[PDB]
Amino acid sequence: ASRGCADDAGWNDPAMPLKVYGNTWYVGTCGISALLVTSDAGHILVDAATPQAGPQILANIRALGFRPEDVRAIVFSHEHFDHAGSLAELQKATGAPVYARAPAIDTLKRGLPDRTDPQFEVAEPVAPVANIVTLADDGVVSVGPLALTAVASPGHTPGGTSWTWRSCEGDDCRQMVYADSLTAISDDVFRYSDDAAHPGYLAAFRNTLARVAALDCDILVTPHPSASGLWNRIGPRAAAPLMDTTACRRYAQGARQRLEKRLAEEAAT
Numbered sequence: 684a685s686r687g688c689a690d691d692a693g694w695n696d697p698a699m700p701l702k703v704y705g706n707t708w709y710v711g712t713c714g715i716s717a718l719l720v721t722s723d724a725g726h727i728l729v730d731a732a733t734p735q736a737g738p739q740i741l742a743n744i745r746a747l748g749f750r751p752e753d754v755r756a757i758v759f760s761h762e763h764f765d766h767a768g769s770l771a772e773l774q775k776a777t778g779a780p781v782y783a784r785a786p787a788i789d790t791l792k793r794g795l796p797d798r799t800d801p802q803f804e805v806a807e808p809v810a811p812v813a814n815i816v817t818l819a820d821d822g823v824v825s826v827g828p829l830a831l832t833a834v835a836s837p838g839h840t841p842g843g844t845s846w847t848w849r850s851c852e853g854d855d856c857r858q859m860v861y862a863d864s865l866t867a868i869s870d871d872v873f874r875y876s877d878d879a880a881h882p883g884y885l886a887a888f889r890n891t892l893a894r895v896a897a898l899d900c901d902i903l904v905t906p907h908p909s910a911s912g913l914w915n916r917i918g919p920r921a922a923a924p925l926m927d928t929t930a931c932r933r934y935a936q937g938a939r940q941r942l943e944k945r946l947a948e949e950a951a952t
């Protein structure tokens with residue numbers, strides 16, 4: 684029997700790929716999510732894990748019997764190296780454009796963020812993404828019968844996006860949400876409370892939390908699997924129901940508490 688993935692797994696610890704629900708598959712690592720949303724017209728790849736995870740993601744797509752070349756669109760959560768890291772390499776392998784909201788694009792072209800990113804000073808470089816299609820903040824990415832809807836999720840980064848779509852197992856369809864990271868973390872310099880340094884940034888973060896909280900939400904997945912207890916819901920260690928219509932509300936509500944705790948820590952400094 685397989686031991687599965689721990690909640691404290693290394694970001695590059697390999698995971699056996701598995702179904703999440705219907706035509707949504709998990710192809711990431713034990714520590715970092717990536718998803719493949721499939722059809723007989725081609726596929727949408729969601730996220731890219733670290734700069735080291737390219738071959739793992741490609742091997743996992745193939746392990747499930749899908750061809751990387753049948754991927755017709757790549758989307759991602761946010762422009763940190765641990766989720767955007769292999770985007771260039773995956774774009775080479777698949778031939779697919781990468782869709783990005785405007786505030787993430789400069790990071791993807793430079794290979795590093797600027798000071799708009801809370802983690803600017805700790806960012807690790809990523810291969811620049813050659814072919815980017817600009818995504819409207821509520822845009823839809825369509826491949827054949829597939830339709831992924833962008834929910835702009837600035838806060839953790841300026842360019843972050845959550846994704847939502849429907850996956851079906853027969854006549855039974857579920858609203859999938861791949862909710863972006865909502866953690867109020869930063870380098871040692873950035874202050875979420877210094878509005879003059881970035882006007883409206885924290886208000887947009889709060890608005891993001893409210894919007895995620897309100898999403899129709901049958902099955903939640905997050906870029907760090909443990910942030911949503913993913914490995915208690917799929918895989919060998921699962922002992923909670925996969926479907927939970929409260930999950931996005933609990934996730935966003937938790938992130939709000941932690942954001943407020945971050946503001947308290949800044950006030951004390």
Ligand SMILES: [Ca+2]
Nearest residue numbers: 864906907910
């Ligand atoms: Ca996360």
Ligand SMILES: [Mg+2]
Nearest residue numbers: 915920921922
């Ligand atoms: Mg468990």
Ligand SMILES: [Zn+2]
Nearest residue numbers: 761763839864
């Ligand atoms: Zn991040």
Ligand SMILES: [Zn+2]
Nearest residue numbers: 763765864906
């Ligand atoms: Zn991350």
